[model samples]
Target: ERVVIGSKPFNEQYILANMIAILLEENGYKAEVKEGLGGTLVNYEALKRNDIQLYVEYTGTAYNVILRKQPPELWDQQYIFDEVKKGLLEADGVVVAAKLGFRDDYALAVRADWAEENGVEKISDLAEFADQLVFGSDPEFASRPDGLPQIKKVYGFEFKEVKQMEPTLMYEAIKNKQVDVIPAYTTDSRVDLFNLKILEDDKGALPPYDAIIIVNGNTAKDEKLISVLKLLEDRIDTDTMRALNYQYDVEKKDAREIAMSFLKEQGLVK
Candidate 1:
């Protein structure tokens, strides 16, 4: 039997894993799904141990969190894909099957009303008020080289105050005006549902973190599974993904149902 693994209860991970499972099933594989498999470390260990077959992961997170390296400043999609493919191939027989159609990078967000009121439309515009605004981010952002510190160094931004909060609460913090600005994921559904206005990073300080599917080295040998999943590579973009995420996470729709609907619409499944 072919078994697939996915991370805990997040919309993006769940949807990506389900898409793989559906594609495999369509190609006549006896696929089973093991959901809520904990964090990246646990899942990667599982892949190494050959306890699970596949899951979805981000290139930047793999490079920074898993491999412990400083990712390139100018991260082109193809470049990051090639680097990750090479690293996984040499490390433990893991290989990226296909990069999903979308890339989810980091962005800074402010409340929509705040932006309208202040006439702040872009990151460059925020420069004028750097000394008066308070910025908030996940605790790791303060120390991680890829996080706010890098943004500060690259953009020369020095906020009047910085607050560190849990990832789940950061959105709320921004919504309530406890913080004037916060770092957010590009594909995060809350950005739209909460109506937060994303500040364009005019200087392009962050690197691309494209989403991709990873499979156990041995599993990559399954020709049928590969063929089906390959159809999804570069097929979907950030906007489509964000809408699907919003449907599941914010609209309280089931992940499997949403995945099935999307796959069928894309003609990947009937």
Candidate 2:
């Protein structure tokens, strides 16, 4: 049987897509990976239509974008996982097979110097200074309900000015002091490369965004596929994922090469 995989347009997603494809191929299935298949909705639609049999999705992305749920009063990874698991199965006959044990969620980051000087380590600490600060955002994070709007609702703070730009440009803007803070990916290497401190969402304003492996219902019935997927549960943690992303983003390694190396390191493949 041939299994098709979908991946979003990012280093992390590409690596994950390659991992799944390689693992399935090792197990005797003909696997094909379609990379950079757009964002949450696009990939979700493709899955629903059975255009792709498997893909990696973040719990918070599924919760907010697909299920249209509001941010919880408190962030609970297990609860979010369970909720998304149930929501996807019922709504689109999709299955959340496994949580890869990492969270690459949306976080607000500021230069280390700025954070230390302002005595800001948590998002709540920004409230007092937010009105005078400029915020940089990517296109989606700037307007998504689970993004700035929720941050405002939960934190009760707004920036002096909001600048929407390319995701990578936000790093440059924050490091150069053109913006005081920017929404950042928890897994991104730039967070460390730019010497930015990721402020804590101490109040749990953002939903938990643990990475999950999802399969179309038809694929779920395949015993070999399910068994192969089981090997991935809790296999990757935040730091490991970040390092893998580092290989892709900084070391300039190929996603498939990175995937093969990691799988071999984990003893998941020969």
Candidate 3:
């Protein structure tokens, strides 16, 4: 069996892609990972066209961004997951394979020093300094309704500069002082590695983004492959995921190396 996996351009995605590839290989499947192929839509389209077999996606993203649905009035994880599951299957013939057991929701972060100096501990606290600081974001975050626009409206503040860049680049830009603020992913190890402080969303401006696997419906029909992949379900908690991310982002380890090490540690593969 041969499988091609798609990954977004980021450290965590790289690690997860490698993990899935190795798992499949251990099960007698030759798997390839198309790393950093593109963002949400690009990867989803790739799966739709049978360009790749599967990829990891977050529930909130599949619902809000890919499916183009408005956020529900209530912030319930199960509801979002069910909606995404139904919507993807019916609309695009995709399958929600498994919930990977970690939620990597969006959060804003600033240099710890800057936050300390300004006494900014929460999102609302940034209002006074927002006008003076530059905000950097991933390409999608700048446009997503639950992203920057929602933050600005809920908090009633706007940044001096809003730079749209790749997801991982925002971490480096903020650390180097190129940007004063960034929309940081919660599972990203760089938040602690770079000594950045994640601001609390006091107003609950963003929705929860739980990590899940979305597969091409036809590819998903392989019970053996789906069962093999489901071994990852409820396996990676937030702390475990952050540590895996640390191995790649901070230690400069290759994604495959990190993935294999993790699998061996957990006895998933010999």
Which residue pairs does candidate 3 place in steric collision? Answer: none
Pick out the ten consecutive residues of candidate 3 with the lowest summed lDDT. Answer: 68-77
Evaluation by TM-score, superior candidate among 1 and 3: 3
Question: Model 3 scores what on Cα lDDT?
Answer: 0.90
Flag regions of model 1 displaced more than 4 Å: 34-36, 118-144, 152-170
Rank list by TM-score: 3, 2, 1
Clashing residue pairs in candidate 1 are none
TM value for model 2: 0.91
TM-score of each: 0.80, 0.91, 0.95
Model 2: per-residue Cα lDDT over 48-111, one tens digit each: 8999998999999899888998767687888888899999999888998878889998899989
Q: Which candidate model has the greater lDDT, 1 or 2?
A: 2
lDDT agreement of model 1 with the native: 0.78
Task: Report the error of model 3 at residue 236, Å.
Answer: 0.8
Q: Write the per-residue lDDT of candidate 3 for residues 140-189, one digit (tens) a residue.
A: 88778777878876888878889999887899999999999998999998
Q: Model 3 residue 173 lDDT?
A: 98
